[PDB]
């Protein structure tokens, strides 16, 4: 169990102005800190945020948050469930800003909602420094789905924050799970009414949230084009902190935004080629990502699932690959301890270790 702490700086808020927060389980005698960013899509205008407030309010407000949460997967403290970092200090940061962790805007006279995702991360880090993070050797900023994209948008800012605060010895790293999307053509075309094309949704959200992106990526794409930095293959090469990328090759959220709804019905030639081309494109974007884990499965999210240890690429599990990554960052490849694990087979579930969906 991780225990809730609402932020002492109550100016840093969820969408509705309630205080943001974090869940913490300390492990003193460990100098490893895992800060995990929850996912859960986003909202990008008044109407769709209002809808989200009605039926997904925990993603917009802390008013109903429970006092504890159970750490699962990479957040578990049991070695049996978490071979990788079971003894680390664990932090789960609830996603209550609906902005892919990019926002820097308060609720105000002009703003019905606050979008403070980027500031929530900074404030969590700041308040944790007084709770033991000041003694850290490694801070791994991890996240799934929108939280995985949030890692890509925020890992270098956390590094800069710690450097400016006088902690240059803390090694900041990122683990982005299921947040590496393609701005590809949809299988069928819709107008962005709610299934919005990748690019159109983000372009509107950034203006609505006052969204912020990493500085080097912002300088490349420049004013009006910062939406590009929400796409992993474009933002990743601009980052300086080590980032391990976990991405199913046939991610269900990617297929959803591509208007592919796998019905169980037979798959025709056009859709077969579309799906195979998606896998090949994702694989291609990971070719020069040295720390990656990309199984050929139709699924979504990995790292906080209790059975996250089960999937393997080329016989190596994700917890093992992450351990190999840790070794590779000690102060040349490692015999039998790989970090770059991308399936080459071309169809969902061609890897026998894929999640069953049971
Ligand atoms: C599932 C989710 O929260 N997502 C966050 C971002 Cl960003 C994103 C993108 Cl860019 C695509 C194309 C699809 C899903 C996405
Ligand atoms: C609270 O957070 C805001 C936004 O980051 C910051 O401007 C302000 O100085 C903080 N207040 C305190 C007391 O740290």
151 CB-contact burial (10 Å; exposed 0-12 / middle 13-18 / buried 19+) = buried
Nearest Cα neighbor of 176 from 239, 250, 87 is 239
* Tokens 């069928």 sit on residue: 188
Partnered with residue 316 across adjacent β-strands are 313
The residues assigned a catalytic role are 145, 251, 300
Residue 4's Cβ-count burial label (10 Å; 0-12, 13-18, 19+) is: middle
Q: Given CA atoms 40, 45, 47, 49 in this order, what sign does their dihedral have?
A: positive
- Length reported for the chain: 358
Residue 161 Cβ contacting ligand 2 at under 6 Å: no
Return all residues near 130 (Cβ < 8 A) that are at least 6 apart.
Answer: none
Ligand 1 pocket, residue 187 CB under 6 Å:
no
CA of 123 to the centre of ligand 2 (A): 8
Q: Rounded to an integer, what is the distance from CA 4 to the centroid of its chain?
A: 21
Ligand 1 binding pocket mutation candidate from 37, 41, 43, 234 (most atoms within 8 A of CB):
41
The residue nearest atom 3 of ligand 1, judged by CA position, is: 41
Determine the Cα–Cα distance for residues 3 and 348; give it in Å rounded to an integer: 38
Tokens representing 192?
A: 């962005």
230 Cα–ligand 1 center, Å = 8
Q: How many CB atoms lie within 10 A of CB 307?
A: 13
- For 174, list phi and psi in degrees, rounded to 5: -125, 145
- Helix (H) or strand (E) holding 23, with range, is strand 21-25
Helix ranges restricted to H, the chain: 46-55, 117-129, 146-164, 198-209, 215-221, 232-235, 252-257, 269-285, 318-328
Which experimental approach was used here? Answer: X-ray
Are 229 and 153 spatial neighbours (Cβ–Cβ below 8 Å)?
A: yes
Task: Name the residue with tokens 């789960």.
Answer: 92
How many structural domains does the chain have?
Answer: 1
- Residues 6 or more apart from 201 whose CB is under 8 A from it? 42, 44, 192
Q: Which domain holds residue 176?
A: 1-358
Query: In sequence order, what are the residues at sequence separation of 6 or more whose Cβ sits closer than 8 angstroms to the Cβ of residue 203?
Result: 227
Q: Is there an atom of ligand 1 within 6 Å of 181 CB?
A: yes
The answer, yes or no, to whether any atom of ligand 2 lies below 6 A from the CB of 11, is yes
Which tokens is 23 given? 């869940």
Q: Where are the beta strands (DSSP E) in 46-95?
A: 68-69, 89-93
Scan for tokens 């429970």, then name that residue: 66
DSSP letters of 189-249?
---S-----HHHHHHHHHHHHTB---HHHHHHH-TT-GGGGGSHHHHGGG--S-EEEE--T
Kindly provide the resolution of this structure in angstroms, with one decimal: 1.4
Four-point Cα dihedral 234, 102, 178, 245, nearest 10: 50
Report whether residue 106 contacts ligand 2, using a CB cutoff of 6 Å: no
């Amino acid at each position: 169990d991780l225990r809730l702490h609402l932020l002492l700086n109550t100016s840093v808020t969820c969408n509705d102005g309630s205080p943001a927060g974090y869940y913490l389980k300390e492990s003193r005698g460990s100098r490893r800190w895992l800060l995990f960013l929850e996912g859960g899509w986003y909202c990008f205008n008044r109407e769709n945020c209002d809808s989200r407030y009605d039926t997904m309010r925990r993603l917009m407000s802390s008013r109903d948050w429970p006092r504890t949460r159970t750490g699962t997967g990479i957040l578990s403290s049991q070695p049996e469930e978490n071979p990788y970092w079971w003894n680390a200090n664990m932090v789960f940061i609830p996603y209550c800003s609906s902005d892919v962790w990019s926002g820097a805007s308060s609720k105000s006279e002009k703003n019905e909602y606050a979008f403070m995702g980027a500031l929530i991360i900074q404030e969590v880090v700041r308040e944790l420094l007084g709770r033991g993070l000041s003694g850290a050797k490694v801070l791994l900023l991890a996240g799934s789905s929108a939280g995985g994209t949030g890692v890509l948008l925020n890992v270098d800012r956390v590094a800069e924050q710690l450097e400016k605060l006088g902690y240059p010895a803390i090694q900041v790293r990122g683990l982005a799970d299921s947040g590496w999307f393609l701005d590809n053509k949809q299988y069928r075309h819709t107008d962005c009414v709610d299934t919005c094309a990748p690019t159109e949704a983000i372009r509107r959200g950034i203006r609505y949230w006052n969204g912020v992106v990493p500085e080097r990526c912002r300088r490349q794409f420049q004013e009006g084009e910062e939406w590009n930095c929400f796409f992993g293959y474009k933002v990743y090469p601009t980052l300086r902190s080590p980032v391990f990328v976990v991405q199913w090759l046939f991610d269900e959220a990617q297929l959803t935004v591509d208007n592919v709804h796998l019905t169980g019905q037979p798959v025709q030639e056009g859709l077969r080629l579309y799906i195979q081309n998606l896998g090949r494109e994702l694989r291609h974007t990971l070719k020069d990502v040295p720390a990656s884990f990309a199984p050929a499965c139709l699924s979504h999210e990995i790292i906080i699932r209790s059975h996250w240890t089960d999937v393997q690429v080329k016989g190596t599990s994700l917890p093992r690959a992450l351990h190999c990554w840790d070794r590779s960052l000690h102060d040349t490849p490692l015999k039998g301890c790989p970090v770059h694990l991308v399936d080459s087979c071309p169809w969902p579930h061609c890897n026998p270790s894929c999640p069953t969906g049971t």
